[PDB]
Write a protein that binds this ligand. Structure first.
Ligand SMILES: *CC(=O)Nc1ccc(N(C(=O)c2ccco2)[C@@H](C(=O)NCc2ccccc2)c2cccnc2)cc1
Ligand SMILES: *CC(=O)Nc1ccc(N(C(=O)c2ccco2)[C@@H](C(=O)NCc2ccccc2)c2cccnc2)cc1
Lengths: 305, 305
């Protein structure tokens, strides 16, 4: 029935997006209850970003120096606090459109939807993965900072990402909603190594299961392999090592398709050693790793929220 | 700054999604002002779908046989009318969350966002193209019928698609919001030929321009070609013929990159004749055709709504 890179419905997050202006810089903020969250470098000028002393820069700021606009609504700032790399602005009004929510720090390999915003207004939504090296391959222009990443569980929005920087390599870095960067990155305009990225093996396997479910099965052989022998191949091709924890979370997909995980591993080994011979899998000519086993189950079961 | 298949924010559409039940079948409907729109086969049983007489089947239905639920809200149906392949249910309450909207019949090659829904509840959002053969390659399970496709212009939602059927080939067909199918399809469970699909040449070219803008430029040669000579190649590789209308709409991208459209055509010719040599373009190993020139401009300019 088709398989697409699918983002969560963005409505509940759209109603939380605000514009935050501090003197001259304007970023996006996230308005939940009576608190607005945004990147702390909203307080920086251009020159500041080269080597900012955030504690000293914020000391020059008072509540009234922060202007927060929810579309046309004014939020009056009545308190401010720096938490790690995020600034929290207490406002005098609770957001009436605040959804049920939690703040979550995700693991590499997990996926989420990004609501790209500019000047507090939503521009688009897309699905992506936290890379093993804690970067994301987003689509973010100047002014997108403060855009957030999230997952939705039924009624509950779980915020996991706030956007903070573009590395000189064109990939993206940011924090959880407590302001702690993913990976080694700092909010400073200095060159920063992201480190060797790898392909998310358990996600590739999940996507191969999605392919079989949807009719694409040309890559099924009937070799099998062992975990240790497969991991030798995974290492050669810069794939993350597969663990019994990964095999276990693939269990439901293995059960639906009747294809043992180690059998799918042997198919993946042959795809890695021989490529795709100019064929495609679910409309792709590469091995796709930004679908989790949960993502496949959700899209293949029709789970709503 | 990265390039992603990006859907519109789905909030304005989420607030229009309702569940429509007629005796036993439950589909999605679209609630705008005091009218709910949904597929007319909401009135069919399983056996009906093989060869339905929709006029006779609807004659057995009264206003009170239709149950419409907006989350937990009841809409009282006070009128009903069949328009082509859609059923319109007049309800006694205007949707308070009705956005500014228009109904639009799109052209093949144009793109839109789909809000996949089940039982009136949104499941996910993704971007896709109306194929040249008037199918779409969606992700739709049983119960997704009535999900809609749309574009957003600033404040105005333009609805262009309502989902009606899955062809035995696994691709998808549906109507505009006046109930007229795209392509030759009928809402009947019979085998139906979709016809030769082709690749949307102007969109591939737009995406090549996006690649250059974002740093991927290995495919630039300095051959050029002519429209007629390129179209000979386009025909060989089942690409849509390129017209001066297409060249014109690529003008802004040509102006930004300083790369003449016929020069990009020569690059596309070499990519078609020689493939990608195991390299990638914007993270893909295939020539991507579901970005319009407008889509590239929007994502590359940071246009909000
Ligand atoms: C993630 C993100 O949003 N990054 C970002 C980059 C650049 C800016 N700045 C903008 O002006 C801007 C806002 C929207 C589009 O562009 C600058 C800024 O405000 N002044 C920079 C400058 C440069 C040269 C001469 C004068 C001024 C900015 C502000 C603060 C920190 N970095 C960059 C915002 C956000
Ligand atoms: C696009 C779309 O939504 N198509 C669709 C397929 C199948 C159904 N039906 C369902 O039951 C259903 C709803 C959600 C998931 O599945 C059937 C139906 O209601 N009864 C079919 C049936 C088959 C065998 C024995 C008894 C009954 C359906 C209803 C009307 C028309 N076609 C199919 C809904 C929608």
């Amino acid at each position: 029935s088709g398989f697409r890179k699918m983002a969560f419905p963005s409505g509940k997050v759209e109603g939380c997006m605000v514009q935050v202006t501090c003197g001259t810089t304007t970023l996006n903020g996230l308005w939940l209850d009576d608190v607005v969250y945004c990147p702390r470098h909203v307080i920086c000028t251009s020159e500041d970003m080269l080597n900012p002393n955030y504690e000293d820069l914020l000391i020059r700021k008072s509540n009234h120096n922060f202007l927060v606009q929810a579309g046309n609504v004014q939020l009056r700032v009545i308190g401010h606090s720096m938490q790690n790399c995020v600034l929290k602005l207490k406002v005098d009004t609770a957001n009436p459109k605040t959804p049920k929510y939690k703040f979550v720090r995700i693991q590499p390999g997990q996926t989420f939807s990004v609501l790209a915003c500019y000047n507090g207004s939503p521009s688009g939504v897309y699905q992506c993965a936290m890379r093993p090296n804690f970067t994301i391959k987003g689509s973010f222009l100047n002014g997108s900072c403060g855009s957030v990443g999230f997952n939705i569980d039924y009624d509950c929005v779980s915020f996991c990402y706030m956007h903070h920087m573009e590395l000189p390599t064109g990939v993206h870095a940011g924090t959880d909603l407590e302001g702690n960067f993913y990976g080694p990155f700092v909010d400073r305009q200095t060159a920063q190594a992201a480190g060797t990225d790898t392909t998310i093996t358990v996600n590739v396997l999940a996507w191969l299961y999605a392919a079989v479910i949807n009719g694409d099965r040309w890559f099924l052989n009937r070799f099998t392999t062992t975990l240790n022998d497969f991991n030798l191949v995974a290492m050669k091709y810069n794939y993350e090592p597969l663990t019994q924890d990964h095999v276990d979370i693939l269990g439901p997909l293995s059960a639906q398709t009747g294809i043992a995980v180690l059998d799918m591993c042997a198919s993946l080994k042959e795809l890695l050693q021989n490529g795709m011979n100019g064929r495609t899998i679910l409309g792709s000519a590469l091995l796709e790793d930004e679908f989790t086993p949960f993502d496949v189950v959700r899209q293949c079961s029709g789970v709503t929220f």
